Ligand binder design. Structure first.
Ligand SMILES: *[C@@]([C])([C][O])[C@](*)(=O)[C]([C]C1=[C][C]=[C][C]=[C]1)[N]C(=O)[C]([C]C1=[C][N]C2=C1[C]=[C][C]=[C]2)[N]C(=O)[C]([C])[N]C(=O)C1=C([C])C2=C([C]1)[C]=[C][C]=[C]2
Ligand SMILES: [Mg+2]
Ligand SMILES: [Mg+2]
Lengths: 240, 233, 211, 222, 235, 195, 244, 231
């Protein structure tokens, strides 16, 4: 078999292949995650270079791993499918052997472990993907939001963004998001998520996707018109 | 798992004051057929060990080759192969015992009963038994097959316990062994008159006697025996 | 063997005998048929002694690793399932192991029956072993959810006694456990010889037996 | 058909004292109605103040002992010459036995020594690895002859104090090494009389904080 | 290109030496061994204020009697921790006892050089393994990706290591109490850290014979930080 | 386990499954639910050798749940039944086959039709208006042959099912401890708590 | 050893791109243009054969349009040999699905499977990727008519109208201009041919330089029919639309 | 230069540079001395610490009751090779009821190290070993190099500044060989030999490591206050 060590240390103590995988994430479309008091919202950019697209059948940016957990990403699209599939298999494998659905923290730890494994295994390259994993643990009303990256490190976030121009939207979230008082309602949480994407997106038409996840496996994706109403209200307040 | 085909009967042995004696007949039986009459079942290893083998002859020939190859291998990169690092009886036995127990554990045994007789570096007598099951034991007298039932009782009258060994001479021990071989010829239906005998002494070394015969047999009393009860003529 | 275990208002009772046999021969008078997996988890044993000890101690290894990875104690439901999954690997290979996994977790007190076929059953009351029928008789006629800790311990104790008396392959002594939300509590070793005569006098039972 | 198992007879006996332990066994080795050896050692000093005997099928017994002796050697290498405690040895032997759950070592195994508090310890096994610490245990051919005698004379079972008539038991006073050795010798002399596979010789290994000591006694050779 | 298991002209494995450079970029971790216990402390170093700092897990339990701190590419530590936990509990299964801290460390270090063309590269993380056993008492080990492990009375690893190690050189003595060690870790962490030390960006832990391995609460550490400030202002 | 029945009426599928579980000579449980929800509108009951039944059912459940998540779409009862059959047909020639018989009751939301599939451990699939496994059919099929209509209501289906259980309770030597009844229709799966 | 000669086909550039995937896409940009247009009542697949000869046997030739099953077809742009490897795998996958579930495979599931195979060659194995881009035209009862495209990266996306191969930039602009949502198959046929006629590098668009196919519900009642156009039929539709 | 990229490449002058670089790792390692008489064999090792808070890296490893070695270079490689010896010593005991000859132990180490010098992908061992033992032909001392070369010697030394100790032993040859039935005097000669390789630092209680094997002496290691006698 092909055993070649592709991810290796350089003289300055860097694994370039893992770092170049982060550059692939930098190229990817912007994804954002914001957790309110009783919900989490996942926002995703859709680049408008591709029109004549069939939005019914085109792979959505946010993917359900189980009925209570979702996964969005930034980076190589093809790479993300492999992580999503593995995650979905592990989710069912956990229910089958332990009789409880995975916690959001466990699922994140698994996906992060897969990413890490591909940084010190022979004949393979790292995943050019960073993920935002969100949901609610079984019989728990505390929101969960985690981030992973090609190296395999993961951590929990009150709010986080990844992908192209993520530096800008993170800047926005850092000054707008208050920890002492997070978005109390769904509206406030979505509004803040849309506002953050409007710093980067360009047009607020079909370029913004929003997915709201509430406790007890209550996951819904907002439509174009519903999002467009947020876009309208934000700019009308801005004209002042 | 197999069944033994061509077989060798009893191997008998005993310790005496300065060494060990071992003996076995020269027959290779094919069931009730006394097929082969020139089979050597005592196999010397160097000048300090004799391995006596009973049971399946094809497996005996295989073991014979393992021992021949063992001597070759021991000499490799060994300037003391004919001195301090020569093969000992205890080394040869433990090797065979390892092989026998491994083969039985794979359910493919060497269908044999083996007695390793020899004298160690320090002059100590070595006499130990091993068989197809990997079972091992040592005693002042050892015998396989029919020898266990008929020879041991005779040999144990000479050396009944450990303290009788220094009191037993080579002439007495050889005499006991030779008598035992005669008794086996009288009573074992798969035995032969012709046999081999080996003496390993700490002073005189290895003496290997071939083409020995059972002699001084009692048959004359047969003439008087008539019928199976009431018949007089 | 005879083992039993049942849920009630104040947790779960677990009671086992202590005999071991090799044909008609009583090979052991005092074997421990309960394993202390952790401070809140117990496992009863019935069937092949070796199988019971090996696999339930392997379960404890696996339950301990769960705590280290997750920073939290394993549920009774998950623990019972790990064990039932072990049984399914050696499916048809000739293992003989009947066990109850007793404990207290976030759902309250838990009790699962697991056997060598990979069977996994949740319930309020179970009894395994050669003398389980005798134990069930006493349990079924006297069990309530509203039992006091004192009355519940006695019921499990008395139920094993019933089996020890009639079943030839059950006896020796009775080992009692009481599982609470602060953990299991051992309630001693009770010789059946002494217990029988004591219960006979105090209760008035076993009238047919002379003493 | 090839039968990989056999029966080499023999009987073994372990008794735990307050600050000592004994492991005894006869020295006779047999197949069917024949004697292989009148002196074939069966109880071994395995190191770290531990004695062991695997009785039943000698080939499997020798293999187990050989493997445990090896386990002790590698325990020293891997864990900085740390002493293997008797409880740790017992657990190790369980795994050696269960490694052959589907092709068992055909032996009844007993080990003896001292626990970490210096008290006498005996551990007993079945052929597939179930074990436990015991005060008294006889194993092998005449195990059923000897065990009841030990229940009576070591644990004072069915023995009550005269005058009370069954109301008060005989108190469980500890036994000295001299008293234990008497019970061992009488156990084997009795077993030798009524069991054909028991006889020839008796070898006892006594374990104390000072080390391992041996005592040999002749038995009837019929 | 060149082999992964290649020796340099100086007699060192290139990849092992390069992994050591990655460990120098990692966040600071400090360990101090005393006769009352071993203290382990780490710099969390959150990359952003929105990152929930309590999810940063750079101190980890291996067994009840063994703890572990990490520095470098912390993602690489997860498989090492998993192996350590498995080795610790497996030994408990085979021998019905706790495993020696040294033996546990040796088991972890056996993974180190299992790389070639097995894993494709050495680990990019160093570990401080602290624990207690009956034979050798309270112990602190430093496990490297070279496969080498040294025992230490006190040790610092990460970006502020040589500065912290020089400070540990002067401060450590054989009669240190547990409380004194706690304040000493906090003191040296505060010295080498970029941001100002508090209960949210720095974590403490210890291992004692009685209570075993414990990670300290943020409320408990906050008091020790306040106790440190006052005693430094005292002279 | 012992008895599992199934009946497909006008607008639903009804599955009845015994509650007894026996080891040796003792009935360990009299409230066992011999069924798994494969999807919101697909229910599978099962009966066969100890242990194999639940393991197989849960393995099927996991696979269908995996499909549902991957495609964000519920498989038709026909598709699920075919998947299950193939797994059993694959199993029968294995080293150690899974000795499990199943009934799959589902409501097809596309066609707006209830569907009942009977599959035995060999992988023998048949679509039926009513079905059973083992000896259950010997007692009940004569009643079903007589009383069954395809335009029956759910309530009439339950009444005919009661008659089948009464006949089983009269003429079967074994005590199966009554049945748990579940209904599968357009609105999903629900349990009849009083039967 | 062998390491010396390894090109390392599955690595990132410093910018975070996959070299071989990018170079495979460069190869595909020189391939004959293929166009797919989805309408309300069907799908059109049109493709240009590359500089043919008069001695090429056209009626038995197939380099662009392939049938995966009765409901799904693909247009190829790139190395034909590479495409046939993938096509045969896709044909098997569709049959595996049909055997398992007793239903025809949903279009997306087939597309995802092929795209996952392409992805694998970019992440592991040390082999060169497939120098192929597909346009998938298919139908199922969930989403109805569907167009997809996949490329050597293993990334796939859905489309109303799309082009692959040469001059996709020019072709996509022309499609974006004239395409409407309420469009029909007969109109889409005309759009496809008109777009090829303007983007082609050849002097004039003729029947012998084209492969053409439609997927219509224009089959007797509720069912779908695949029509791979014959040389004479392509000649007729070229006259009908007013190109020749 | 161009021929040092891997172990599978000869240089134009017939040299194997990766092996030579592995040999270089031994020279960087701390000094260790080996010497023997006709009755006993002794190892003496200067242990090295990381700093004052650190412990002193162990240098001597036991292989059997009658055999053991001291290391110089990559310690993990010594652990691998010593583990291999432990297994080989043990295979000889379990199968042949025979204590492994020290000469044969050297032959096995040679062959194990050699395989790593001729194959692609792997690397040579980066450690040197001094093996001592007492077998049926008396006391023995071996020097192992990771090139594969194993040499039986009366005395030797490897590591940094090892030439000083080696010269001393070359002078003392006739004296220390005759030290029969006197373990303490043989150790003294070893401690005096290793002292010739010291600069700046001297032999302290936690610095010095000694091992001995002989006629009626199992392989035992002396560390800590057990070696204060010889300082
Ligand atoms: C009842 C007493 C008898 O059925 C009970 O089931 C016990 C359960 C038990 C659980 C844990 C520990 C000990 C016992 N079972 C036995 O005692 C079994 C019964 C049995 C014999 N053969 C068999 C059985 C069960 C299933 C298949 C086959 N007995 C044993 O397993 C025998 C072999 N055990 C011993 O002989 C033991 C000895 C001697 C011994 C043991 C077990 C444990 C510790 C020290 C000594
Ligand atoms: Mg007799
Ligand atoms: Mg059927």
């Amino acid at each position: 078999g092909y055993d070649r060590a592709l991810s290796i240390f350089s003289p300055d103590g860097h694994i370039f292949q893992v770092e170049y995988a982060l550059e692939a994430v930098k190229r990817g479309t912007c994804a954002v995650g914001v957790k309110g008091k009783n919900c989490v919202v996942l926002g995703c950019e859709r680049r408008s270079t591709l029109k004549l697209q069939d939005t019914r059948i085109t792979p959505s940016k946010v993917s359900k791993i189980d009925s209570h957990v979702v996964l969005s990403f930034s980076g190589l699209n093809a790479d993300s499918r492999i992580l999503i599939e593995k995650a979905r298999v592990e989710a069912q494998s956990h229910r089958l052997t332990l009789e409880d659905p995975v916690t959001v923290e466990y699922l994140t730890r698994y996906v992060a472990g897969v990413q890490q494994r591909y940084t010190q295994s022979g004949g393979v390259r790292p995943f050019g993907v960073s993920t935002l994993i969100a949901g609610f643990d079984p019989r728990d009303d505390e929101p969960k939001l985690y981030q992973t990256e090609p190296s395999g490190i993961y951590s929990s976030w009150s709010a986080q963004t990844i992908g192209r121009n993520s530096k800008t939207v993170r800047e926005f979230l850092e000054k707008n998001y208050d920890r002492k008082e997070p978005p109390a309602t769904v509206e406030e949480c979505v509004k803040l998520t849309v506002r953050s994407l409007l710093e980067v997106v360009q047009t607020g038409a079909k370029n913004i996707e929003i997915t709201v996840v509430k406790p007890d496996s209550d996951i819904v994706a907002l439509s174009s018109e519903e999002i467009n109403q947020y876009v309208t209200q934000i700019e009308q307040e801005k004209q002042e | 798992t197999q069944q033994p085909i061509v077989t060798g009967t009893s191997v008998i042995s005993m310790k005496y004051d300065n060494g060990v004696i071992i003996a076995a007949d020269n027959l290779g039986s094919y069931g009730s057929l006394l097929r082969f009459n020139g089979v050597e079942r005592l196999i010397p290893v160097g000048d300090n060990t004799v391995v006596g083998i009973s049971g399946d002859i094809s497996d005996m020939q295989h073991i014979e080759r393992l021992l021949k190859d063992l001597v070759t291998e021991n000499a490799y990169d060994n300037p003391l192969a004919d001195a301090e690092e020569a093969l000992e009886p205890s080394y040869i036995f433990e090797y065979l015992a390892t092989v026998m127990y491994q083969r039985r554990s794979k359910m493919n045994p060497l269908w044999n009963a083996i007695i390793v007789a020899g004298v160690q570096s320090n002059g100590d007598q070595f006499l130990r038994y091993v068989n197809l099951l990997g079972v091992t034991y040592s005693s002042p007298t050892l015998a396989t097959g029919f020898g266990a039932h008929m020879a041991n009782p005779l040999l144990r009258k000479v050396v009944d316990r450990e303290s009788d060994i220094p009191k037993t001479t080579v002439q007495v021990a050889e005499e006991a062994i030779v008598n035992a071989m005669r008794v086996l010829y009288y009573r074992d239906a798969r035995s032969s008159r012709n046999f081999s005998l080996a003496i390993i002494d700490k002073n005189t070394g290895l003496t290997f006697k071939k083409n020995l015969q059972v002699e001084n047999m009692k048959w004359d009393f047969a003439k008087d025996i008539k019928g199976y009860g009431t018949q007089k003529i | 063997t005879t083992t039993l275990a049942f849920k009630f208002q104040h947790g779960v009772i677990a009671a086992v005998d202590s005999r071991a046999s090799a044909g008609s021969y009583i090979s052991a008078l005092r074997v421990n048929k309960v394993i202390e997996i952790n401070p809140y988890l117990l496992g009863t044993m019935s069937g092949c002694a070796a199988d019971c000890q090996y696999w339930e101690r392997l379960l404890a290894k696996e339950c301990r690793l769960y705590y280290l990875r997750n920073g939290e104690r394993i549920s009774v439901s998950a623990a019972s399932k790990l064990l039932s999954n072990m049984m399914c690997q050696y499916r048809g290979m000739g293992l003989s192991m009947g066990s109850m996994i007793c404990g207290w977790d976030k759902k309250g007190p838990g009790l699962y029956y697991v056997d060598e076929h990979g069977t996994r059953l949740s319930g309020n009351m179970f009894s395994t072993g050669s003398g389980n029928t005798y134990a069930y008789g006493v349990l079924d006629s006297n069990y309530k959810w509203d039992l006091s800790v004192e009355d519940a311990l006695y019921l499990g104790k008395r139920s094993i006694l019933a089996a020890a008396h009639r079943d030839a392959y059950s006896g020796g002594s009775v080992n009692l456990y009481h599982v609470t939300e602060d953990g299991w509590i051992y309630h001693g070793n009770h010789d059946v010889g002494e217990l029988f005569w004591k219960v006979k006098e105090e209760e008035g039972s076993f009238n047919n037996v002379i003493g | 058909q090839f039968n990989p198992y056999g029966d080499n007879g023999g009987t073994i006996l372990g008794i735990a004292g307050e600050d000592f332990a004994v492991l005894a066994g006869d020295t006779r080795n047999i197949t069917d109605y024949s004697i292989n050896s009148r002196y074939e050692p069966k109880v071994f000093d395995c190191g770290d103040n531990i004695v062991m005997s695997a009785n039943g099928f000698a080939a499997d017994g020798d293999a187990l002992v050989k493997r445990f002796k090896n386990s002790v050697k590698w325990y020293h290498f891997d864990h900085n010459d740390k002493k293997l405690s008797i409880n740790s040895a017992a657990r190790n032997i369980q795994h050696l036995l269960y490694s052959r759950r589907f092709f068992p070592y055909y032996v009844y195994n007993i080990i003896a020594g001292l626990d970490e508090d210096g008290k006498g310890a005996v551990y007993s096994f079945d052929p597939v690895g179930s074990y436990q610490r015991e005060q008294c245990r006889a194993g092998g051919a005449a195990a059923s002859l000897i065990m009841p005698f030990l229940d009576n004379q070591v644990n004072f079972k069915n023995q009550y104090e005269p005058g009370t008539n069954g109301k008060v038991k005989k108190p469980l006073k500890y036994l000295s090494v001299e008293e234990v050795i008497k019970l061992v010798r009488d156990s084997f002399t009795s077993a030798t009389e009524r069991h054909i596979q028991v006889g020839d010789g008796l070898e006892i290994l006594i374990v104390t904080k000072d080390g391992v000591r041996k005592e040999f006694y002749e038995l009837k050779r019929d | 290109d060149r082999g992964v298991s290649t020796f340099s002209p100086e007699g060192r494995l290139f990849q092992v030496e390069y992994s050591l450079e990655a460990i120098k970029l990692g966040s600071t971790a400090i360990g101090i061994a005393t006769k009352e216990g071993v203290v382990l402390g780490v710099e969390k170093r959150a990359t952003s204020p929105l990152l929930e700092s309590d999810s940063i897990e750079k101190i980890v339990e291996i067994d009840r009697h063994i703890g572990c701190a990490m520095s470098g590419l912390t993602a690489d530590a997860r498989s090492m921790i998993e192996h350590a936990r498995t080795a610790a509990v497996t030994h408990n299964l085979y021998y019905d006892e706790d495993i020696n801290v040294e033996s546990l460390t040796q088991s972890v270090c056996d993974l180190a050089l299992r790389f070639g063309e097995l894993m494709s590269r050495p680990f990019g993380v160093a570990l401080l393994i602290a624990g207690h056993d009956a034979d050798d008492g309270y112990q602190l080990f430093h496990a490297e990706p070279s496969g080498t492990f040294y025992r230490y009375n006190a040790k610092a690893i990460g970006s502020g290591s040589e500065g912290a190690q020089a400070e540990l050189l002067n401060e450590w003595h054989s009669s240190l109490t547990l409380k004194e060690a706690e304040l000493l870790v906090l003191k040296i962490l505060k010295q080498v850290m970029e941001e100002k030390l508090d209960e949210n960006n720095a974590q403490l832990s210890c291992i004692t014979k009685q209570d075993g391995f414990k990670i300290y609460d943020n409320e408990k550490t906050a008091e020790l930080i306040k106790e440190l400030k006052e005693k430094e202002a005292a002279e | 386990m012992d008895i599992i029945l199934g009946i497909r009426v006008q607008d639903s599928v009804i599955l009845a499954s015994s509650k007894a579980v026996t080891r040796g000579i003792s009935v360990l449980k009299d409230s066992d639910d011999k069924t798994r929800q494969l999807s919101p509108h697909t229910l599978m009951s099962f009966a066969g050798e100890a242990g194999d039944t639940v393991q197989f059912a849960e393995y099927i459940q996991a696979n269908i749940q995996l499909y549902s998540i991957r495609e964000d779409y519920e498989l038709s009862p026909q598709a699920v039944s075919s998947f299950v059959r193939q797994e059993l047909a694959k199993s029968i020639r294995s080293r150690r086959p899974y000795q499990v018989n199943v009934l799959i009751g589902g409501y097809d939301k596309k066609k707006n039709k209830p569907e009942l599939y009977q599959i035995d451990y060999l992988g023998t699939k048949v679509e039926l208006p009513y079905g059973a496994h083992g000896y259950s059919g010997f007692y009940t099929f004569s009643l079903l042959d007589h009383h069954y209509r395809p335009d029956m209501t759910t309530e009439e289906g339950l009444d005919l099912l009661k008659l089948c259980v009464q006949e089983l309770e009269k003429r079967m030597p074994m005590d199966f401890k009554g049945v748990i009844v579940k209904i599968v229709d357009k609105d999903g799966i629900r349990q009849v708590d009083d039967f | 050893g062998s390491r010396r000669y390894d090109s390392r086909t599955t690595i990132f550039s410093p910018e975070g791109r996959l070299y071989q995937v990018e170079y495979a896409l460069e190869s595909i940009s020189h391939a004959g243009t293929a166009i797919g247009i989805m309408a309300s009542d069907g799908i059109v697949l049109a493709a240009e054969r590359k500089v043919t000869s008069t001695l090429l046997e056209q009626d038995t030739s197939t380099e662009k349009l392939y049938k995966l099953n009765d409901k799904i077809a693909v247009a190829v742009a790139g190395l034909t040999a590479d495409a046939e490897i993938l096509i045969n795998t896709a044909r098997i996958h569709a049959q595996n699905y049909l055997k398992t579930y007793n239903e025809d495979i949903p279009v997306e599931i087939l597309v995802r499977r092929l795209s996952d195979i392409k992805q694998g060659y970019t992440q592991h194995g040390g082999l060169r990727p497939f120098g192929v881009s597909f346009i998938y035209a298919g139908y199922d009862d969930r989403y109805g008519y569907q167009l997809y495209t996949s490329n050597p990266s293993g990334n796939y996306t859905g489309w109303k109208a799309i082009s692959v191969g040469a001059n996709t930039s020019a072709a996509q602009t022309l499609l974006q201009m004239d395409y409407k949502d309420d469009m029909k198959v007969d109109d889409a046929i005309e759009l496809a041919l008109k777009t090829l006629s303007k983007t082609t590098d050849s002097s004039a668009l003729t029947y012998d330089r084209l492969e053409f196919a439609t997927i219509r519900k224009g089959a007797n009642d509720g069912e779908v029919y695949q029509k791979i156009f014959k040389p004479q039929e392509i000649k007729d539709i070229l006259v009908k639309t007013g190109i020749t | 230069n161009n021929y040092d990229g891997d172990t599978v490449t000869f240089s134009p002058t017939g040299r194997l540079f990766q092996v030579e670089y592995a040999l270089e790792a031994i020279k960087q390692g701390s000094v260790t001395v080996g010497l023997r008489s006709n009755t006993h064999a002794v190892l003496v090792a200067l242990k090295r610490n990381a700093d004052e808070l650190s412990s002193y890296q162990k240098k001597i490893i036991k292989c059997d009751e009658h055999m053991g070695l001291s290391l110089a270079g990559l310690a993990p490689d010594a652990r691998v090779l010593s583990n291999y010896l432990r297994q080989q010593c043990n295979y000889s005991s379990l199968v042949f009821n025979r204590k492994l000859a020290v000469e044969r132990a050297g032959h096995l180490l040679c062959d194990k190290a050699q395989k790593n010098t001729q194959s692609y992908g792997g690397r040579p061992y980066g450690v040197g070993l001094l093996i001592i033992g007492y077998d049926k032909s008396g006391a023995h001392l071996l020097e192992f190099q990771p090139s594969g070369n194993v040499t039986e010697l009366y005395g030797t030394a490897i590591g940094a500044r090892s030439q000083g100790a080696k010269t001393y032993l070359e002078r003392t040859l006739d004296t220390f060989i005759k030290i029969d039935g006197n373990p303490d005097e043989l150790i003294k000669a070893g401690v005096e030999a290793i002292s010739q390789s010291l600069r700046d630092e001297s032999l302290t209680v936690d610095n010095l490591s000694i091992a001995i094997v002989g006629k009626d002496t199992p392989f035992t290691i002396y560390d800590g206050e057990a070696v204060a006698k010889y300082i």
